[PDB]
Design a protein around this ligand. Structure first.
Ligand SMILES: [Zn+2]
Length: 54
DNA sequence: GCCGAGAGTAC
DNA sequence: GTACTCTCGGC
């Protein structure tokens, strides 16, 4: 239905207002270093809570 | 296989 | 006016 989020279209400016808002992030389980805090949550499901939630 | 980053929107 | 989430490609 809605178009997908493609970063291919022209006029793709890279403002720091998207990276500046996030601060470095470390994993308390395997000390993995994730830069974006949002990505840190994803790391939890990838190398830790990646098991069935049931 | 994981990682890193852009856009659209709400308050 | 900021940060939020969802997505896509790259090595
Ligand atoms: Zn970890």
């Amino acid at each position: 239905p809605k178009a997908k989020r493609a970063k291919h279209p022209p006029g793709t400016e890279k403002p720091r207002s998207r990276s500046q808002s996030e601060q470095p992030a470390t994993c308390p389980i395997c000390y993995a270093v994730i830069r974006q805090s949002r990505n840190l949550r994803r790391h939890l499901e990838l190398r830790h809570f990646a098991k069935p939630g049931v």
